[PDB]
Amino acid sequence: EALGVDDGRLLVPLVLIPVFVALLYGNFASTQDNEDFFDTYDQRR
Amino acid sequence: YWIIHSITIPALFVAGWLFVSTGLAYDIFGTPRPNEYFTQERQQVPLVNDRFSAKQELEDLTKG
Amino acid sequence: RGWFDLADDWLKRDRFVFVGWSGLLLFPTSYLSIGGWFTGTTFVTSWYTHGLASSYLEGCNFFTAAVSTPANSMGHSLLLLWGPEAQGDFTRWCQIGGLWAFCALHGSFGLIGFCLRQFEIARLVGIRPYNAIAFSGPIAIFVSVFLMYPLGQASWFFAPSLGVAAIFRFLLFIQGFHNFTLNPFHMMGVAGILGAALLCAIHGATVQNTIFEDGDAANTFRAFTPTQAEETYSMVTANRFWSQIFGVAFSNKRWLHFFMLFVPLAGLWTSAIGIVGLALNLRAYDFVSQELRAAEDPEFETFYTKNILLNEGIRSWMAAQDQPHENFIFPEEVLPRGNAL
Amino acid sequence: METLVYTFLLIGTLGVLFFAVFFRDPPRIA
Amino acid sequence: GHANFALLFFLGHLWHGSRTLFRDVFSGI
Amino acid sequence: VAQLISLFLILTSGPAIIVLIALRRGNL
Amino acid sequence: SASLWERFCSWITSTENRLYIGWFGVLMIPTLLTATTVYIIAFIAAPPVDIDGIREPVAGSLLYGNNIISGAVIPSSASIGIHFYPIWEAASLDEWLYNGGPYQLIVDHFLLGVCGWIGREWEFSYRLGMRPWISVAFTAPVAAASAVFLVYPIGQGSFSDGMPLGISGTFNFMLVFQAEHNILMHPFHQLGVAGVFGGSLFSAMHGSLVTSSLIRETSANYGYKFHGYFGRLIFQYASFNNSRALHFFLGLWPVVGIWFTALGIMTMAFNLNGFNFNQSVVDSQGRVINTWADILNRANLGMEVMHERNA
Amino acid sequence: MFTLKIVVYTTVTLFVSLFTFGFLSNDASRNPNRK
Amino acid sequence: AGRDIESTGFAWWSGNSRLINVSGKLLGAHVAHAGLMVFWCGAMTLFEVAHYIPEKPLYEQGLILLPHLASLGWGVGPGGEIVDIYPYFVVGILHIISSAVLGFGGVYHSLIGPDTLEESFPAFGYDWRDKNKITTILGIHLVILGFGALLLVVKAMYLGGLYDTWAPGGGDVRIIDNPTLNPAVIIGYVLKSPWGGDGWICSVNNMEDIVGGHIWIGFTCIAGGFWHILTKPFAWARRAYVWSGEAYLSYSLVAVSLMGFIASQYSWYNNTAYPSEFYGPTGPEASQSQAFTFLVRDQRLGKYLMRSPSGEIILGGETQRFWDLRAPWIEPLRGPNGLDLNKIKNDIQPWQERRAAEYMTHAPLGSFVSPRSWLTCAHFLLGFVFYIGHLWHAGRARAAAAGFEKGINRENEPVLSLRPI
Amino acid sequence: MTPSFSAFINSLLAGLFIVIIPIGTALLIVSQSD
Amino acid sequence: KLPEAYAVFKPIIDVAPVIPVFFLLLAFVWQAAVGFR
Amino acid sequence: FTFRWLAIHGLAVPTVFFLGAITSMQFIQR
Ligand code: CLA
Ligand code: CLA
Ligand code: CLA
Ligand SMILES: CC1=CCCC(C)(C)[C@H]1/C=C/C(C)=C/C=C/C(C)=C/C=C/C=C(C)/C=C/C=C(C)/C=C/C1=C(C)CCCC1(C)C
Ligand SMILES: CC1=CCCC(C)(C)[C@H]1/C=C/C(C)=C/C=C/C(C)=C/C=C/C=C(C)/C=C/C=C(C)/C=C/C1=C(C)CCCC1(C)C
Ligand SMILES: CC1=CCCC(C)(C)[C@H]1/C=C/C(C)=C/C=C/C(C)=C/C=C/C=C(C)/C=C/C=C(C)/C=C/C1=C(C)CCCC1(C)C
Ligand SMILES: [Cl-]
Ligand SMILES: [Cl-]
Ligand SMILES: [Fe+2]
Ligand SMILES: [Mn+2]
Ligand SMILES: [Mn+2]
């Protein structure tokens, strides 16, 4: 019932796809200045 | 002026009140009172049937 | 100068309320129509015309009070106070519904006077008279609904009565007896009205959200001065926004405002054409192919057939009290029902 | 057969919308 | 037909009367 | 009558503060 | 730029694509396209749907005998209720089609798409550096659509009570709603009617005043390159001298009206119906004197006695 | 029915993840006034 | 001056926007509004006690706070009957008296108190951009909320327990001895489907699950509060959010909008945290009770039954759409297959019939405005308008961060730099 | 001459002496005076 | 009904729930007195 | 006796009369 997952195989897409895309985001996040900014939003990008 | 209004406006309001409380509105506009919607002979809804005898028909209906 | 010249000069004076030549027709007719509506909704009953109570004196509220249409015995009579129906008697004139005719006629002449007022004032300010052409929409609505429809019907009785609940009754009565939702001209009218509301909202939001930063205050209503030669909002930014959000956008402010004018006017005129068609019972009530399919196939049902059944139920269950002059008496057995089907 | 006419009219309207969106007169500053 | 024609021609009367009476300011103010 | 009197006193208590502040010319 | 994900972000959020995608467009486009194609396919070929749940299907497709006006996507079966009914939760594709599953598919994907459209309007407003409250204006039709498609079935307990995706189905929804709830006497539908009528009036007025006072620079529309009249028509005080305030009012009035009518639909979904002035006038003897509200109630009763179609 | 469900779950998860991580990629900096 | 459009740029109708950058007056405004809320609670409780007719049930008198107090177990005996209204009076008096203290605090911190706090009380001041301080305040108030949840738990398990409709032979005030602390049940409730037949968190149908979930919520809130006090937002969180008062306001607005929708659905559907002896039956409950009463009057002196889409035996008719209802007066008559006809024939109790009849009489959906209807409509409307407020305040927070909330810069309009499409 | 014809001619006069004649009097009177 | 001792103060209890609305109105009154500055 | 004066009293003397009439209607027995 949780997330409508009645077959374990459904969890493979649910976890692998968010991880893989996070992996693409990890590279954006690592190429950034992650020092604190003291402002409303971070203009460094 | 204000003084004038202080007399005219309340007098006019009282006149408007008395136009209803004394029953003159029913007589002037033909509006039936709550006790004269249905007569003893006519227990149905009164409706005009002819346009050229409407005055006489209403006189007959509202006579009682 | 000549009397006319002096009267024209006096009527054209810059007072708090412009009078003008058109005022001589507008002010008395409109004042009498409004006062007659108030008098009817306050004192005059509908007991001898519709078998109903429609006055504050009888106990009605704002929603249920109305100036009801004349009795179905009157026909399309002008119902003059001195006319043969009333013969000068004010009480009988009010009882037969003559106040409705008073309000309708003096209000039609008031609408004519207001249109002439728009024309006159436009000729004095020196602008194109695109008002009194927009107002032709409401004029056509009033003429088709309150004048042409009862004239095409049996009498003034089937015109809308001047009241809130009376207008709602008129809506349901027309739906039941004409299937006016199925009328394509009414569909065009609905499209025009909804599109005009859409245009008003979207244009207001677009202008408010594309203003130039012409002030240092967070509240930006002060940054607009009355005599502003420059534009107060960015047309280019608004165009780019809608070009890339909706796929198409206005680039000409003139065209945009003419379109915002044109949509409600066209909708109202199409709805007026539909109501004129209804006036002679020339209605798009039914689709012949669908009726034939449903007749030869009891298992064939669409929402149109359900609407037909709903209209039949409306007519059958409202005929007895909505048309008391006909003396309709329907037994419970012949009254349509869902279980009866 | 009227279903063919209805479908033809609907797709023609959709195609008109498509051509109005993607083949409009390109706005320019004058 | 003729009732709808009469209504549309009332609209036409309004438009063409506005055109002929306000001609000077037609291109604009 | 009691409801009306209590309502009147409560409705007076609000603007009374503002009136007293204006009379004393405080930060209104 | 420096990252594949950065390049992808700089293309999803680019202001150079003919039509902005944006992040909301990442959810909006698939859902809207899915709902669009499913709606088209259902409107042409869908099988009839047993909307009442008593094994008498109702046809709404062009191929089963409907026209453009009478065609609709029939709401889901009353046996389904408001149960989630995707394709994979049905035993067969035939039974899915028979119980009105495509209606649920279209409704859900369309609601997701209109939420994405609100967000995408905000997103492109932020990308262009303009003010973001066009989406606040667009919330009102979205609220109305969600009330007639989702909130009312939730309150009533079945998607069969939702508005059918058609013209005659819409008319049937309006008539049944008026019968059951008396929406005409509901003050919020009155506010919505005032909103739409005022929107039409104000759009016509604003267009007339702008077109009337066009400065001679010339069709007159080529004169454009990419208050006194109004204050004399009515008394002088009633006039919008500030153009920004006038346009704010133009945006505000119909949006507030549609918000109120959507709220009214939501309240009547939980049986907070309209005003009831029935039998409000009686004579001395106690007999009920009918009003126009009584005639309206008679019409509502006439509609209601043929909706049950059962006990 | 399972294969359609797994395809739909894959597609929805992909699009939702793209949305979520796109709005996490410093979306506020993507404005014309940013330096 | 700071109290006019000349010095602030905000008009009178946006005047509280002048409170964004002054902390003391903002704190006073919040404390004054809290005092208003507590005053309304106490005054409405006193109003409801003052209009309470003993013979009528709670739901027939238009009362909404007395059912809330009765669900907690105060002044209610077996079967949902109300014994005394004195604890309700005490609750109203306590709220309406604490309202005076809160109102005095709000007035003090608003009018005579310092406009800014950091120059005089550095432990309370903030800048709306110091992420550590804002997270510290968030953590402190999180600890407060967790302690409130644990206070509800203590009331449930120690101080008199809570009313349970699922007690045998009608509801009763019961001590929740063993709440459900198993994380699987709570996670399944949180991750359940929200559609028909599942209901997500609205479908919690026993008091043990409620108490266990509130235990988990309280301890989780305490842990998260200590976390946010002792930590700083991470790099992914810092670059994703706008750090200003209006942005935090918009976040709170969308949160409370979702909460309002959830509460409206709770009042409409749930009959466990909202007992039907106090709030009246739900719409599905009323329809199923009418069908069950007709079935009983058919058995005394089959018609009235059909099969569900999954094959189970359910009540027939227009009610079929409400077969997912679970009510205490109908559970003993339901077996693994569905409702059992012989069990209804034999194992039926008079109190079940009385409950069914009294719920049939008063129907929200229609067989009298149910208090469930008022609560659901009010909080659904509030959720919608607060979603609108969240959208407005979030858009304006984004625009103000970037610097274009006052309009477009004529000197450098962005569109003019973009090439035409 | 039917009572209807009489009512019509009297209607014509009342319009002249109650609507047309008074309202113009004001316009000629007040226009000439200003 | 209220406890019997406090039953005399019912007319206050019957007006107290609506007090916050007046507070809103009171705010407007202050903005009126201040001249909507 | 100005146009504003006459128009105001035309819209005031019936208004007060009708307000008094409606106030009297409010105290009818019904
Ligand atoms: C519940 C809602 C609420 C709250 C808590 C506040 C609170 C505040 N507002 Mg806001 N405001 C509100 C609604 C609210 N307002 C609304 C609805 C409007 C629109 C009309 C405004 C418009 C507005 C403007 C335009 C401004 C404020 C300002 C202020 C602050 C100071 C006000 C001042 O100078 O008082 C002066 C008022 C008085 C001296 C008279 C009232 C005296 C007290 C408060 C009456 C309380 C009665 C109560 C029963 C007393 C209890 C006593 C206790 C011992 C029990 C304060 C923080 C101002 C500010 O600080 O900006 C920087 C400012 O400029 N507000
Ligand atoms: C009102 C309470 C509150 C608030 C405002 C915050 C606010 C914040 N927290 Mg804190 N936190 C809280 C309570 C709170 N927290 C509690 C109770 C815990 C204990 C579990 C934590 C533990 C915690 C950690 C460990 C971290 C934060 C972090 C953060 C920051 C970013 C959070 C974010 O992006 O969400 C992201 C949200 C999601 C990814 C969604 C997760 C949803 C889960 C799977 C449940 C799903 C429920 C349901 C299926 C969907 C919602 C439906 C809805 C209707 C309920 C932000 C400052 C982060 C940070 O930067 O601080 C250092 C961080 O690392 N928080
Ligand atoms: C906790 C919730 C919360 C908070 C703290 C704020 C705070 C703020 N908002 Mg936001 N807002 C919210 C919810 C919230 N809002 C919601 C839910 C909506 C959607 C309706 C909005 C819509 C909104 C807009 C559109 C605007 C703000 C603005 C503001 C600022 C000034 C507010 C002000 O001066 O009020 C002044 C108070 C009034 C003028 C009184 C309004 C009275 C309403 C219309 C009556 C409603 C019916 C009433 C409750 C019934 C009582 C009956 C009585 C009349 C007899 C301030 C930062 C303004 C701003 O400056 O932006 C930064 C702004 O433009 N907000
Ligand atoms: C509280 C409330 C809430 C919402 C906002 C709100 C709406 C503003 C407010 C309402 C307030 C209210 C209640 C406002 C209501 C105000 C009222 C009742 C005004 C009544 C005016 C009556 C007039 C003008 C009648 C004139 C008679 C005439 C011309 C006679 C005509 C004659 C007839 C009959 C025909 C024969 C000829 C003659 C002799 C010519
Ligand atoms: C219950 C309780 C417990 C026991 C003790 C206790 C003390 C006796 C009591 C507490 C009582 C308390 C806390 C009492 C506090 C009571 C209060 C705050 C009363 C405020 C009243 C203000 C009003 C009615 C303003 C009306 C203005 C209007 C209508 C017009 C405004 C207009 C203006 C000018 C500006 C233009 C806009 C509009 C809106 C048109
Ligand atoms: C004991 C007893 C037995 C039974 C009977 C009993 C009498 C009921 C009971 C009594 C109980 C008692 C005695 C209860 C005591 C009740 C009292 C006196 C409650 C007063 C609370 C004051 C509040 C909420 C004011 C907050 C100020 C605000 C919101 C101002 C805001 C403003 C700001 C800041 C600035 C301007 C804007 C505005 C909005 C105007
Ligand atoms: Cl139907
Ligand atoms: Cl039934
Ligand atoms: Fe404009
Ligand atoms: Mn229903
Ligand atoms: Mn029905």
Residue numbers in the entry:
A (entry chain w): 29 to 73
B (entry chain e): 20 to 83
C (entry chain d): 11 to 351
D (entry chain t): 1 to 30
E (entry chain b): 454 to 482
F (entry chain y): 7 to 34
G (entry chain a): 10 to 227, 232 to 239, 252 to 336
H (entry chain i): 1 to 35
Question: What did the original publication write about this model?
Answer:
Photosynthesis converts light energy into chemical energy by two photosystems, photosystem I (PSI) and photosystem II (PSII). Different from the red algal antennae, cryptophyte LHCs contain a unique carotenoid alloxanthin (Alx), as well as Chl a/c2, which are therefore termed ACP (alloxanthin and Chl a/c binding protein) (Zhao et al., 2023; Mao et al., 2024) or CAC (Chl a/c binding protein) (Kuthanová Trsková et al., 2019; Zhang et al., 2024a) instead of LHC.
As in the previous structure (Mao et al., 2024; Si et al., 2024; Zhang et al., 2024b), 6 antennae subunits (ACPII-1 to 6), together with a linker protein Psb-γ (CCPI-S in Mao et al., 2024 or CAL-II in Si et al., 2024), are found in the PSII-ACPIIs structure. Psb-γ is located in a space between two antennae subunits APCII-2 and 3, and connects these antenna subunits to the PSII core subunit PsbB. The inner layer antennae subunits ACPII-1/2/3 in R. sp. ACPII-1 shifted to a larger extent than the ACPII-2/3 subunits. These shifts result in changes of the distances from antenna Chls to the core, which may alter the excitation energy transfer efficiencies. There are also a number of water molecules assigned to the density map of the PSII-ACPIIs structure, which are located mainly in the PSII core subunits.
